[model samples]
Target: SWLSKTAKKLENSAKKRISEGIAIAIQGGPR
Candidate 1:
């Protein structure tokens, strides 16, 4: 249970970072 919890947290954090990165890349405003 403990391992699963930690794994899920890490996965979510990773996904969040990826989404944020995509947003930042898009912010270049109409390439």
Candidate 2:
């Protein structure tokens, strides 16, 4: 359920998401 919002955000992005995704992964997700 938590990944739902992130998925929507990522769903609207492209290459930019690649960079920030790792950031979120490292720092922990939006949850």
Candidate 3:
């Protein structure tokens, strides 16, 4: 429960904070 909770939340937050979506890194890589 502890690892799952931390890992899941970390991944979710990382995804959101990293780029949010493909538009932020895929096409906007060099913008």
Candidate 4:
């Protein structure tokens, strides 16, 4: 249960990072 919770948090962070990257690409910013 503890590991699952930690993995979920990490997954959310990764999704957020990917979303930010996509937004930056769309805006002609860094990759």
Tens-digit lDDT track of model 1 for 1-31:
8999989987998897798789877796447
lDDT, candidate 3, 1-31, per-residue tens: 8989978977787776666466667777676
lDDT of 2 by residue, 1-31 (tens): 6888878777677667787889888889678
Question: Regarding lDDT, does 1 or 2 come out ahead?
Answer: 1
Better of 2 and 3 by lDDT: 2
Please give the distance, in angstroms, between residue 30's alpha carbon in candidate 2 and its true position after superposition. Answer: 3.5
**Runs in model 3 with CA error above 4 Å?**
17-21, 25-29
Reference-based TM-score of each model: 0.49, 0.39, 0.31, 0.55
- Residue pairs with clashing backbones, model 4: none
Q: What is the C-alpha lDDT of each candidate?
A: 0.82, 0.78, 0.73, 0.85
How many clashes does each candidate structure show, in the order listed? 0, 0, 0, 0
TM-score of 4: 0.55
Give candidate 4 misplaced runs (Cα > 4 Å). Answer: none
Model 2 clash pairs are none
Better of 1 and 2 by TM-score: 1
TM-score of 3: 0.31
